[PDB]
Each structure stands twice: as structure tokens, then as C-alpha cells.
Amino acid sequence: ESSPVDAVLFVGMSLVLGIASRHLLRGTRVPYTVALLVIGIALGSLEYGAKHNLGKIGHGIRIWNEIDPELLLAVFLPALLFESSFSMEVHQIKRCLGQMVLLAVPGVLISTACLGSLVKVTFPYEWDWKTSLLLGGLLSATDPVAVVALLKELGASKKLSTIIEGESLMNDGTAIVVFQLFLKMAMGQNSDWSSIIKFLLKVALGAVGIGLAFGIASVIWLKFIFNDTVIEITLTIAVSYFAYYTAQEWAGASGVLTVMTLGMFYAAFARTAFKGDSQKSLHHFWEMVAYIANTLIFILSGVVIAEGILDSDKIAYQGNSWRFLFLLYVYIQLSRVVVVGVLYPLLCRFGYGLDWKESIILVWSGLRGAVALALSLSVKQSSGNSHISKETGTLFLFFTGGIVFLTLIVNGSTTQFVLRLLRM
Amino acid sequence: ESSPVDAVLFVGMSLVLGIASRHLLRGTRVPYTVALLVIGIALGSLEYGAKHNLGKIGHGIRIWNEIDPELLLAVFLPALLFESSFSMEVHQIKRCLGQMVLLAVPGVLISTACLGSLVKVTFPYEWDWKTSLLLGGLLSATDPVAVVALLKELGASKKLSTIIEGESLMNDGTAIVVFQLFLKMAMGQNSDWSSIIKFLLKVALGAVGIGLAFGIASVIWLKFIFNDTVIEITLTIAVSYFAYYTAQEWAGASGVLTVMTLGMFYAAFARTAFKGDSQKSLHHFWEMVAYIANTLIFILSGVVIAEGILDSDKIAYQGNSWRFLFLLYVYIQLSRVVVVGVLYPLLCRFGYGLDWKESIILVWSGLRGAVALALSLSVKQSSGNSHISKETGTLFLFFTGGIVFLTLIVNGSTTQFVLRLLRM
């Protein structure tokens, strides 16, 4: 009965369920992530919706369903984001840092504002300031994996595909702080406009610092460490997964920023300690780790959607949700528009500039992915409280697990089509 | 309080502590596993023996101390015994199949009896024959990793470094079946003489078959699968950890044999399906997964040894244990002698033969490692029953820990000395 070994079964099944998808969806427009999400939705519906006795597979599903709200993050978010923070070049980022900062930081502090105000004034589900701008902050998070999987699959400029790539790998570093502050306000405090500057001074501003400290320590150690690849590969794990803990748990910060700045430093200086025997292996190991984390997140996020919304069709049958996710879809398009527009003055005059075709390609390339789903899971799995309740934590996940599907399918197919029409 | 995320601390702690040892104990005779075991003993003594509140480290110790038996054996053993199975040279093995068989199968079916008889007739712990042959059949397991570390550390041969290498690689596949049958007999079965033949006909004999089936299916898929290194590595993980589950949990077999036969099949028939891009990545990834598993096992089996023997110094203060592990050591040495000698007639007449120097090096080199420690740890995590009490399982773990400590602190240094003394 729910034997712990059954959990390994999930690791043995989801992965292959991912692998087949990656085999069955290679040249097709639809990525494997949406296939994983729909498979997870169907499996969860068969497990909790119909309550069919499924077996040891069901035992594994029920084991990973009770994944702890922050253990989920500690296992998957560093895994999801160290590949992206690590597999980025520095030569093409020192030429566009100004254009990335003013596409990521004021690219999310306005993106959250717009599409959060719209849902605050439009959703009749009896929401608030904090619990609606929390959704605004979490869902304005673009996958740094799907964007690269489109900007390398589809031929594009080496500098445009640099903008679309360097945008996401700070969107998911400043959409997790415009997430955590509103989550903290919703859960255990109030709208304190005096301690926001304290929260943003501890988190981020010390997360990056502790990440840099761990990075310099690890690079010194690696320079001291002689020729042994398996020591270095496991030391990357022993520093990332440990600095994440020392940040979130021992400093109350956002350890995701710690694991991302570790990748920042490594990619900046992966030539003084790492040898040529390790570049070809570590960049293959961490992409596989991110692939595993992405598969598990996109399938367990379908399982949890089915657990929450398909208990007794409590939310699925309601018409206040199915016709309102498309409303947030047009809201996120409007948010992307009002993010590119209000920044274009300082965007085209900084870094590399932006042509009209380049601008219209940057829009419709904002692919939502595993980070928004992971944060929605981190809220739904931490629901049931007085303020954050079953009608809100589950609604975050219902909204995100449909919007990430829509952005990854329709917004990808139409982006490919408009790229084909708009010759470049 | 005992937050699950604290488990990552342990993953973040051991994985750096081992990296310390492997860095410091690089050119020293004693391996890093001894340092890991002594560190684990120290931490367990500090948290249980003295009940010192370490803090979140103590919570991590406690989250990785209720590890369930067949979750202990479903995460580490398939990982601890796939690096060696996969990294097997078959061209040098097809010339010694008979010599490997008549060092593994009758190499353990005799060495189990020789140890079990002496411990049964000498240990005053009121030990049944089944639970004494259990120790005799689980302690006759030599890890491939330590023996290959010694035989590649310094000057050796190609007809010796392969015989000891193919020795351990099946000693920890027939010290698993001579372990599980004794454990099953002690748990809830009798001494029926048809039960043993049924058990051997089903288990390891359907395990090899299912491992071959999974291997051929995976190789067909790889032949279908185009150039994707990360897909291939993920498929290797999702076939090893999933075939183990399908064997142990869906067929009652010993999946530890299934993962090993998958490794053998990959080493033999799967070197052209994998491209040259993958032969440098899988051999760098699995040598690190096994490194992680070996680092976790040698410290987990220090913490659990401490919690079993340092509760209230229930067993440590007893003089029936601290002077009886050396009796087990001399029994191990005698068993090694009487297993090389009895087989020497047909051993030197098949394969590469065996000179007197080669014979005296094959004996006296029976390095006990993490495979016996893991089995004793699984037994202790299954203790508390009427047939085997908590005292019996703790005694198993203590005896195996002492044997693996001794054979890795002394049997290696003395072998290094006697190879230069005996003009190798």
C-alpha cells in the first residue's frame, strides 16, 4: 500500500513517457511539453476523476501527488534553471546586457501590473490585491527552454535569438521575486509598503551575493581539483543543490536566484577551472537533468490539476473558469504589447536595437513553460490556509496549466507561421 | 520540524564531504570510502550517541534515516551496480568466461558455507542457521569499484586486473541471490528443499531474461533514436531504474541482477548503437552516479550503524562484538583461502590460468565494499520482527561495517605492500 519504491516507478515511467514524446514530436510544430501535459491530465483524470483502481502506477501517482510544496522547488527549479543559467554565452550578453535588463526587470514589473490589474477588475471569483498580483507575477514567466528550442529549431538572427534567449533567463529570476513577495503577503503578512524594500534587499540582493560566494568558492576548489571529471560534475550538483538550500532555508531568500547566479558565474568563467574533457560532458549532463525536471514538472503538473479540479468535477464543470482562461490569454498578449511598447524608446536605442519585424517576433515569443507551472504547483500544494484556500491555490494551477498549454501550442505555431511569412 | 527539504541538505552534504575525502585521500593507500564511513559514524554518534541537536543537519539525517528497505535497494544498488556492468570490456572477458564463473558462482556457494558454519558454531548471540548463513552469504560480496581502483591505481597486469575485475562483477550478483534466499527463509519461510529450487528457478533466472528483454528493446529504440545524447542518457536511466522495478516489484525477482545484466548487455552488444558522442558522456555520467551512490551508502551505513549501536550503547559496550568482528575477519581470510584453493585445480586449467603469484594476489584481495554494507543496511531497516529482532539486524550492520572498514583500511595497504615485496 503506497510502498515508497513505487515513487521510483514514476521516475521510471514519466521519463520514458517523456522520451517517446520527444521521439514522436521532433519536427512537428507542437513541442513535447504539451504532449506531456495532456498525458498527465488524462492520467490524473483516470486516477482521481473516474477514481479507477490503476495499481502500482496509481501508488506512484499518489506518492508524488503529496510532494512537499518546497521540496518540489528544491528538487526541480535548480534542475530546471541551472542548465539555462549555465548554457548561455557571455560574449553575446556583454553586448546586450542593457537591452536584457530593460526587457526583464521593467519587462516584468509592468507585465505583472497590467495583466494582474485586468484580472483583478475582471475575474468574479472574489480575489484581492495580493492574491491576484501573485498570479500576475507567477504567470509572467517565460520558459528559457522552449524559447531556445524555437530560436534554434527555426532559423533566425544570431542577435535576435540572443535577445529571446537572454530575456527568459532573467524573466525567470524576476518573476520568482514578483511571485514570492505577493505569496508572502497573501499567506502570512499584509500589504506592508514599508518592508517591501527590506524584502527586496534581503532576497535577490543577497541571493545573488551568496550565489557569487558559492561560485567563487567552487571555482577556487575546481582550480585546486586536478584532472577528474566525475568529481567536477558531482561538485556542480553539490554546490547548486546545496547553495539553494543555504539560501532559501538558512537565509530566507529566493534560492532560485542563487542557483541561477551560480550558472551565471560558471558560464562566465568555464575556462579557468573546467577542462576541455569536462565541457562536452557537463553540458550534456545538465541538459539531461533539465530534461528530466521538465518532464516531471509537466506531467506532475497535469496530475495535480486533475487532483484539484477533478475531485468531483468541482471546478471543471464551472463555466467561470473555462471561458476565463482565454480572457487571461488575451490579457497576456496585451501585457506583452504594453511591455514592448513602453520600453521601445529605451530598447531600440540600447544594445542592438530592434527592427519592426524583430519587435513583432519578440512578441508572440514569450513562451510560458515549466517555471510558471512549478510556481502554480508550489502555491496549490501549499493551499488550504485561511487566506490562500482551495478555491484559489487550485485556480492558479487551472489557469497556468491551460495558459502554458495554449502559449506552447498556438503561440508557437503562429510564431512559426508569421516567421515564415515575414521574411528575415 | 523534520521538513522534507532537509533531505536535500544530506544530498548537499555527503556529496561535498565525499568530494573532500576523494580530494584529500587521492594518493594515499586507504580509499575515500573509509573516510566516508568514519565521518558517517561520527555524525551518527553526535546525533544519537550524544543526542546533540545539530539542527537542520539533524533533520536531514532523520529524513535519510527512515529510508525504506526496498527504496534503499531501488535507488542505490541499480546505480551502484550499473557503472561497472556497463563499463565492462567484453573482448577481454570472452577469453575468461569459465574462469569468471568458477570464481563467482562456486566462488560464493562455497565461501558462504565456509563463513556461515564458523560463525554459527562460534558466535554466542544465539543465532539460527538461516540467519548465520544469511551473514555468510551477504558478507561474501566484493565491490567492483574498490578492486578496479586498486588494479588501475598502479602497475598491474592484463590477465590479473581482468580476473579480479570479473570476479567482483559477479560476486555481487551471486551474493545477492545467496542473500535473498537466506533472508526469505529467515523472514517467513521454512527450510524446504524444493523451496530453494523453485526460488532459484524463478529468481535471477527470470531476472536475466527480463534484463535481456529490456536491453534488446532499448537497443532497438536506440537504433531508431537519432542523434540525441540526452535522450539516450535519459533512456538508460529510465530502463535501468524501471526494469529494476518491473523485476523486484512486478515479478518477485532480484532486480539487482536485472540492472547488472542490462549493464552486461549494453557493454557487449551496445557500442555501435551509441554514437561516439555518447561513449564519452555515459562513461562520465554513470561513473558519477555510482560515485554518488557509493558516497551516500558509506555514510548512511555509518549513521544507521550509530543509531543501532549507540542508542544507549546497547551493543557498543558489549564485549561480544568489539572482539568478535576480528573473528569474522579471520573467517573471511580463511574462506578466501579455501575458495581459491579448492577451485585452483580447474581454475589454472581454464582461461588464462593462474600462477602462484597470481593466485596469492587473487586471494588476500577480497575487497569488501558498499554492496555488502547496503545489504546489511537493508536487513537492519527490515529488523524489529520476531524471527529477526532489532538486535539481529543491528548486529548484521555492525559486523558488515566492521568487515568493510577492515578490508578497506588494511587489505588494500597490505596488498600494495606485498605486490612490491613479491616483485610484481
Curated annotation (Swiss-Prot), chains A, B:
* Extracellular topology ranges: 51-70, 120-130, 184-198, 245-249, 306-323, 380-391
- Please report what switches on or represses expression of this protein: By Na(+), in a SOS signaling pathway-dependent manner.
As for subcellular location, the record says: Cell membrane
What, per the annotation, is the impact of changing G107E?
Answer: In sos1-12; hypersensitivity to Na(+) and Li(+)
PTM notes: Phosphorylated by CIPK24/SOS2 in complex with CBL4/SOS3.
Enumerate the Cytoplasmic topological stretches.
21-29, 92-98, 152-162, 222-224, 271-284, 345-358
Subunit structure, briefly? Answer: Interacts with CIPK24/SOS2 and CBL4/SOS3.
Residue intervals passing through the bilayer? 1-20, 30-50, 71-91, 99-119, 131-151, 163-183, 199-221, 225-244, 250-270, 285-305, 324-344, 359-379, 392-412
Gene behind the chain: NHX7
Please identify the protein, giving its name as recorded.
Answer: Sodium/hydrogen exchanger 7
Please give the range of the full-length protein represented by this chain: 30 to 453 of 1146
Expression by tissue:
More expressed in roots than in shoots. Mostly localized in parenchyma cells at the xylem/symplast boundary in roots, hypocotyls, stems and leaves. Also present in root tips epidermal cells.
Its UniProt miscellaneous note says: Positively regulated by the salt overly sensitive (SOS) signaling pathway that involves the kinase CIPK24/SOS2 and the calcium sensor CBL4/SOS3.
